[model samples]
Target chain A: RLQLDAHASIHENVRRLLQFTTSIMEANEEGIRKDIDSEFLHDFRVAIRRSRSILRLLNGVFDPEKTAWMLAGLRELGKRTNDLRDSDVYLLRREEYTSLLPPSLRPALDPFFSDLEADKRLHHRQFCRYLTGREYSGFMTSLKEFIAEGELPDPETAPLAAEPTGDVAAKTIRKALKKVLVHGRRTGSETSDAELHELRIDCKKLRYLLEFFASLFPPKATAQVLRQMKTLQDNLGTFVDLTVQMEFLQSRLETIPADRGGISEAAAIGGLLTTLYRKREKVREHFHEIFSGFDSNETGELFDELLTGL
Target chain B: RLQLDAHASIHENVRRLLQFTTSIMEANEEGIRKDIDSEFLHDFRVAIRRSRSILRLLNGVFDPEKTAWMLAGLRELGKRTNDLRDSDVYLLRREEYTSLLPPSLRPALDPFFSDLEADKRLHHRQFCRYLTGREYSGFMTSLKEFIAEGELPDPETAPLAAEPTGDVAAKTIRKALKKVLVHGRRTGSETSDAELHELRIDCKKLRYLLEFFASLFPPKATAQVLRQMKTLQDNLGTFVDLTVQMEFLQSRLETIPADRGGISEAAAIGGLLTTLYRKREKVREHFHEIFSGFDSNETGELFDELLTGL
Candidate 1:
């Protein structure tokens, strides 16, 4: 915990956050290259995502033009790993998904799963190539150079940049949490799926904000608050993942070669779609029960105590 | 995988299963002696428990007088580690339990957890002494000798002894599963708490029976069945643990002396009680839904196809 230097400026704190996340990415890069386990890529993506969140959280605290492409590059890096994760997820659930169907149908799904495995390998290769490619090399070099270089933000353009980081962090956390509460509360039986999806994005911003400044809070208090946040986040996450996975399966279902005994393969996908959609609907319908916890007076009071009472 | 001999006798398989579990226990014994991790003790306990289940499942398959004490020894062995596990559970949950209470109450519970930690070390030391003690050594040596040298079970007293293990195992699994399904279906809104607790024991027996002979079945099918059994098992497990822990806390609460700012400690115990009781009730009420999965026609039909259809 860098201890958030009581007198350090917000720009200084954000710089530390970037350095921390970059090292995490760098450390996990070897594990990813070796394909040790999904855990490696999982950590790699989180660091990448957290770094992006840091830039988004403190956009103008640095020279806007200087950090502009850094955000774009992070986004593209995350995008490159996108299919790999989905492939990993489905493959991770291979036994589970296979068990969902009748034993007779289980054998027919082998080619489909084999296809997912092949897709996983292919995407892993693509990601590795991108990570090693000249573009990524350039991005990495510039990121380090930017992190090492020092400059004072012009007060006229970056007023908050000069504020004591602890004060600024607390203020920013409250503001982001407030935004999440507002978005979360607006969800209801009347809300559309797209609206809830946007709410997931909002909660994510608040989630990353909390993670960035977690060390500043009391450990127990922060853990308690984080626990509450996770329940809401996971429900929203499952709902969104199911939606994307179902769509992805629909595309894969269409890709089956008609020349083969592909009708059986299509039926397996059809059954999987039913399971995925039902799971999605269950989580979708259960949103209010989860959201109500985050939106409640108890949670709000706890957040206030943890986030602002200090 | 043992690859249970298609024509091997039940006694042979029982011997093999015991041999396997004993080796597991032996391998973990050093780890336990080293006090390496809670996991070493965990695996050690499973082997002990499963050995007891083996004797119970085939009570007369071996010399009744010979193996009768083995069950008693295993029970005592398990008892030796009982407090250790409870302590581990509470200590493992130290952070989680602390997080459950308000910050003001959190510090007050430190002594209570410190007490649990102290209790854990005491229990671990006692267990090590018992493992290295004469009683356990004689028990271990006899188990190996009995597994090495065998005499046919008197056909009158142990009619199933000479039966091919695959046949005996498949039948035993069926009978055990049938008992569980009967016990499970008998529960309803009218069921008593004791009945549900007994249900957990029955499920445990069935659980060990499956593990004893998992190699006989197709891997995918066995996993699918195991998955269904676990949800019901975990619910009952949590319920029982909560009951035991709450009672344990009640006893400890009574022991705290009044002289040394004990009011704060008592207050912490009271808070923990409320949380535990509330959790117990939620899981208790949710039992019917979890049991419904195991009780469903779909699950039963699948079990039949996987177990009997073979």
Candidate 2:
């Protein structure tokens, strides 16, 4: 447990967060180097995102210019892995995609997957190059230096930089949770995809905050709220994924010439879209029930008990 | 090199073939056990196929009943690995399949792929279960025992069982080669798909035979002939794949309900069929060139020099 001293300064909490960030990055280093599986890259990327999230959420707790530099560094690192991750996901789910069709339709889909395999080879090569390149090494060195414990350059001058971490963490978590509840409560099965997407973003941020500062709350309360929030997030995430997939398929119908492959490709696409849309609707239908559970009085009371100062 | 003694008995050659088969199986055992990569399973399956091909090609060299039993055992082994290999090929080429479509259509194709992945997982699980099961262990043990040097039950009584291996091997290779050449020469760009498929099977058998007893021929001569054959086989294989894929997509058009995803799916399937048909035609167009190269006097001389005599 990350039992933060309620009276500890913001710098101390920031240091602790940095330590956590370092551990996550260190843990995933071997996985990335060995390229054993996609999960290694995935976990490493998530840690980077979490670290960036902390820096953004606790903005006033660090030197502005340094934080800005760190954010840019993290963003660049994240961007480099995007294509690799996308290819990994497609490659990983290759069988699932092909098996959706009847055996007869399966063969026509060969070129589609062959191209993905080729692209993945290219992307994996690029990823390995970046991982082994001088730029990555330099970046890692800089990150380590930045996170090293030392007197803050302008600790006393920054707002909240000298404040107790427990206070700042509690306030941030409470505010984030409120934003999620407000947005989530407004959503229903009939809501627009865009609206639900926005709500998912809020829920994601709230979950991240809770995860980053769970030690500040009672362990039992933290776990309960995290569990509730995660369920909501999962439902919202699936709903958005389905919507995005449907939109992507619909867009493909426009770009592909009607006469190109003739009817087979188009028919396959149509069947796929229908399947996706139906799935999206199913997830959307489930959303109302999940939201109601999250919004229940018991959940609200638990949030209050956790976030309200004991 | 597998240069058999000029006067070595058929039983000696059979033992050598068995030893070779055992080595291939053993080499792939770890790959199958660890399930490290799909190619492991693929290679293992190929080895099994090669072993079966050898038994079939050198039919009279071993005791008939024992040969039949081994063939049955090999077929059973091959059957168990078929789904895993099929799923691996489809999964491995996933990205290529998705890239064939416009970005819009890609999302619609997700469920198609999602289903394939699920199927692969199930197949992999089944494969693992079989690999670790008692049946597989018993099979392996029996295979080892059959290959071990000892008194061949009724080995001396079998036709060709006491004949010189060099003479038998040369005759078999020559016959297989002649069959391939005859069938290949009959195929043109205008040949029926069924005829071309038959030629592909013939080519496959010849290639497998050459691969099985390659060491008997001079290294350079063997490589030259094998290289020429492989090029032809690749062309023929691709042509067949395209035809099969086209037929599959065409059939899918009938099986899928007309009103389900409606015209979009139909259009997609039609488009895919057109593309596949075009690709198949392209492969057919190139076949004459590949076949001419393989049928040239230079290739025939190389084949004759390699397998003409001891």
Candidate 3:
């Protein structure tokens, strides 16, 4: 029963991840190109990342038949999508830079901006190539084949093995959370904040995993945990966003010579970043508060409250 | 009835435009950061452009009541998206340049590459900002409101200023097509084939518009026009793609230093390009055949029959 449940859970995650990722691709290509929502691409990315993390968590659960193709497909899809994501980010940031620049420096900056524009176009061209490449085709074929093989057990047939069916999902979430928290605490202070945020990402995966499987748990209890994590996750996400932005600003600042006219504009950006940076302390405090609330004792009690009757 | 249909069509297009643009925000920031399938952003671009075009096509169709707000929302979305598109293209092209350099001289190119990368990153940061911007919410609200109100009667329901019920759609398509063909013939010589493809795009829109409303026309006649146009469109698209690639190669060659190295590599690239150009010529022949077929009496007769009957 235990083994079967585990198998079912893995299958559920795999199915959800594959469908989500493929939808992202379809939406990105057909949706965005056809002038649908570009935001779906963003969701698609989240789905891809979540799928990857889930695969990482359940690495040993799958036989070679299930694991190999899924892993390969996820990897290739990730690779093919990277270029589009990068260029999209670049162009978004450049607009901010332009807004920051004074009118006087606009002409000098205009040509550079044009060049950057060209660079974006070039990236897109390569991205289109990769998307249409053999890797993408292989990934799709592998995904379809995996889905076709039907190795995955249905939730009703193998309740514990499949996600959201019973205690197995809750256990999986607890395991992931526990592992990530341990990793977070053990990391040395010397580790970059960037490195530390990876733990937060793990936390997100756990949170999302739990949410995905929330249907199986006590609704009220599941909602409580989900809400709590939402607050914590938002804090962590903001910090990460700021970190990336600051890094971008710093790099841009370094490019202009001190004697250059754009230095003042850089200074103004630095000022805005300082304000963004200041938000981090509060974010950190929120994180600490949230973390403290997630004690094993409380979680165990809640788990009992939610599942003990069953 | 005509006014009602036109109004509904406009509203539908607006909702679609909003849904299309807004959805891109959820894309994986990390993936986009890495330059994966950068062309996928083109989906976002296409959506924005198409929406804007739709707005233009339906100019004066609606009163000032909340129409401006919707248009403004689209404009804001467009502004947010445009830079990313531009930057991805620039970054990708720069990658091509970097890739073309010899191993030894590659180091000499590092600084430029790094600067370009930084520039691209700046663009990315801005995109992220817009991805989370307030305008997005406002856009959503305006779009939903517009869709909900359905206050304006489409062309069918509104009192028609000109033209009968069944014939207006076909007439609209004809106008758009004529514009496309005129643009194609006029701009054929001065612009690179890549740019020339814009005409093909205009042609496609007309085709889609026709397809979408085919229920009003004879199935056999509609199928004939669609089939011929699809063939023409495909050939034109392929021809344009090759031409763009060739133009890209030519531009890159001009940037290569004389004594730096990889002269043979550059020559090889040129050779490959020449082959592509030849292929492009063959595609052009296909285009000629498509155009001649479209100009044939049978094709015109079919379209005329539909227009008159409708």
Candidate 4:
């Protein structure tokens, strides 16, 4: 619905970009505020993240100060919803994590999941309040005005403000892809956790860039690359989710009260940790295949046709 | 959720199949009755069609008379929804069909789309009444009982009813694949309309069989063939949709009211037909690529591993 014309000016593209992301955010607010579904929250988070990415990718097309101000605003919006998302995620996995423990130990972990439900209820309320407050309305009002007025605050020094988006899109996409390949160009798939995190972030940025300019390229080539990126993203997401959840359970266990079913609860948490570690390792084992597939010659053909060829 | 256990009896698989289709039908009744999204109607129709296909493919697992009786019942259910589905399809494509004509001719076709909406409303009401009536409830009640009872009504005469699903699945699937290849093994893409229809249907049957018995095969191999089948189905669906819709428009044009913009409407219909013909031809041109890809050596390897080897 929001296909960008490559021949359009960069300013036009930015206006459309902001409008699309803003619409997604505003549209999901009611559902998120009502705690209707976690997907609404996820989409809201993605809108915020994508909006931030587009702004950050603007290569000197806007005043740095004003761009940073808007970025900060989006970051603030995202931060307020972070705890709710975490709570929602953990609550979702409660059953799966429960099944990882023995039947006797499952009940011992009930308090942990109960606490997560409590966490969700509490954070959901706080997030709803933020959505309901004047702050949100004010922030949204500013966003609407910002989209209406266009992205380039001062055109005189805005280098790429008036350039055709086709001119800018290819170069920007190429730059992002280069950054991704740098992280992915390792001789072996083995990497430190820190490097894995970096690669995942880079993958996301590259994906977002491609999606942002999807209509500017050949549809078939663009879709092919996006599909490859999506599979890579899925495997990475699973690995990260399992790894982080294990760490979360470990941290949560440290706060168990002394002496009244504490050891039982700790044992259940330990059982879940071992299960989660194995699951994460299984996902880790796929990293080589997934990365290799993504880095295949066919993918290179697609990237060359869509990104490098441009 | 209904993943069939390969080692289980064919009766069990048939039981699971009926239950799954029954669930789909009952689940969409409310949405369809309320005239919610068109997708609900589409899904309901699919459930009916799939149910019929499975019953027809039982390959000597049931008493012929009882099997035909249930098929007749499902046929009745689908017949009532036929007009509604047609109207829905045309209504959904109103805009695309509208844009196919010249701007000056656009308004002349308004009554056509308006009639389609009216048709939808009228047929939708009739369908809802059918759903609300005792016959539907009675039919659905019997369906539930049938699922609970299963397909092998008489075990002694049922040839393959008690065979392991995996054993029966491979042979049934192999035969269906052979039939599909018979239709699709054309060296040239040229074919009669009757043959095209036959091929499309055969593609659908093959796809359904693969899906119903997907869990019995290697995940990777099953997925590879399913993906190929899906692309083939999409192209065939598009071609058939365009061809059938053009015929629908032509038939509708024959009954246009005389003397009050009748000629203009006919001219607009003519314009739309030209556009539709070209579009359908474009889809037809992809047939060679689609069929050849589905009939590729890689697909053969998948079929050999999943069906023949089994």
Q: Residue B27, candidate 3: how far off, in angstroms?
A: 70
- Model 1 residue A130 distance off true place after TM-score fit, in angstroms: 84
Clashes of each: 0, 54, 85, 0
| Candidates, DockQ | 0.01, 0.10, 0.01, 0.01
Give every candidate's TM-score on chain A. Answer: 0.93, 0.89, 0.72, 0.93
Q: What is the per-residue lDDT of model 2 for residues B1-310, given as tens digits with 9 covering 90 to 100?
A: 3455556676776777677766777788787767688877777777788778878877766678878988998899889987777677766756765655444445545655676689888888897898778987897788777767555446455677677777777777788888988887776557777878988888888887676567667779888888878888998899887776666557656664444343455644544554455467778778888888888889878877897646
lDDT of 1 by residue, A6-46 (tens): 46777887878888888888888888888889998898899
Compose the digit string of candidate 4's lDDT tens values, residues B45-114: 9988998998888756666666777899999999989999998887888788676554445677688788
Whole-model lDDT values for every prediction: 0.76, 0.73, 0.57, 0.77
- Which candidate has the top score in DockQ? 2
Worst 10 residues of 3 chain A by lDDT: A1-10
RMSD of each: 27.1, 22.5, 27.0, 26.7
Model 3 off-target regions past 4 Å? Answer: A1-9, A35-37, A64-69, A90-117, A152-167, A180-195, A251-276, A279-282, A293-310, B1-310
> After superposition, which runs of candidate 1 have C-alpha atoms over 4 Å from their true positions?
A1-310
Candidate 3 Cα deviation (angstroms), residue B106: 31
User: What TM-score does structure 3 among the candidates reach?
Assistant: 0.41
**Candidate topping lDDT:** 4
Chain B TM-score against the true chain B, each candidate? 0.92, 0.88, 0.60, 0.94
